[PDB]
Design a protein around this ligand. Structure first.
Ligand SMILES: [Zn+2]
Length: 37
């Protein structure tokens, strides 16, 4: 047998969250974090 990490997801700019595409992930950054400089 064998072992390893899970399939690819795009990771958040400010936490450990991840999603399918940047087009979904940006909504998490808009809603859950301070999306400012
Ligand atoms: Zn996040």
């Amino acid at each position: 047998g064998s072992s390893g990490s899970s399939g690819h997801l795009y990771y958040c700019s400010q936490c450990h969250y991840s999603s399918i595409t940047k087009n979904c992930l940006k909504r998490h950054v808009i809603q859950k974090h301070s999306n400012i400089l």
